[PDB]
Design a protein around this nucleic acid. Structure first.
Length: 206
DNA sequence: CCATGCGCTGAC
DNA sequence: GTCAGCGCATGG
């Protein structure tokens, strides 16, 4: 049983694994938080993240992608999501993710002196990210492997407010689940969409 | 205690 | 199509 602050792959969970709901991704240990896009500790780093089209500044290009930090939002009224209404800060999860980069934390942003030496980050792609990405799975959530933070920096987002941006690159020995090799691999391993026990039946009665 | 939150579902 | 909020895990 891996501790909550484990870095790297989760034993027994191969690249290409799929789950229908976020709570299922949590139970596997791959990505503990069931709502937040980032799982991290401000004095340690980020352990994993999910691409789900929640932030307009996100850019997905497969082996490379640009992630936005969280926050700069007014969640008053017991919300979990909203548009940008204030500038983001390099604290909490945003600070946790910056620490993965192989360079001293820099309030103004920084680049890695040999990205590969950075802390590994488990990445999950959710289907809501398919609206603006051809890498997103058609259904559910999919584990795509290990990535590293090549660099991060602040800049005015499409909303006009300041947002934190991270450039992540894949560093995994397993073929991408979206390539020919990946799709064959998933087939040879017999991986299939996992659903909560009783879910398919409950939804079939409808 | 107290904030944060890239989900999810039932309503208009 | 879009939207108002709710339980709960995680961290400090």
């Amino acid at each position: 049983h891996m501790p909550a602050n484990h870095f790297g792959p989760i034993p027994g969970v191969p690249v290409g694994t799929m789950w229908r709901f976020r709570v299922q991704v949590s139970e596997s240990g791959v990505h503990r938080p069931h709502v937040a896009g980032i799982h991290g500790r401000s004095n340690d780093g980020a352990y994993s993240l999910v691409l789900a089209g929640g932030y307009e500044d996100d850019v997905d290009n497969g082996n490379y992608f640009t992630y936005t930090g969280s926050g700069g939002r007014d969640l008053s009224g017991n919300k979990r999501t909203a548009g940008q209404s204030s500038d983001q800060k390099l604290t909490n999860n945003n600070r946790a993710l910056a620490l993965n980069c192989h360079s001293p934390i820099n309030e103004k942003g920084a680049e890695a002196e040999d990205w590969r030496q950075g802390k590994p980050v488990r990445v999950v792609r959710n289907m809501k990210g398919g609206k603006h990405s051809k890498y997103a799975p058609a259904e559910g959530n999919r584990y795509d492997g290990i990535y590293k933070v090549v660099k991060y920096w602040p800049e005015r987002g499409k909303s006009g407010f300041l947002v934190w941006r991270y450039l992540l690159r894949r560093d995994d020995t397993e073929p991408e689940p979206w390539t020919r090799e990946g799709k064959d691999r998933t087939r040879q391993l017999g991986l299939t969409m996992q659903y909560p026990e009783g879910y398919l039946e409950a939804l079939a009665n409808k």
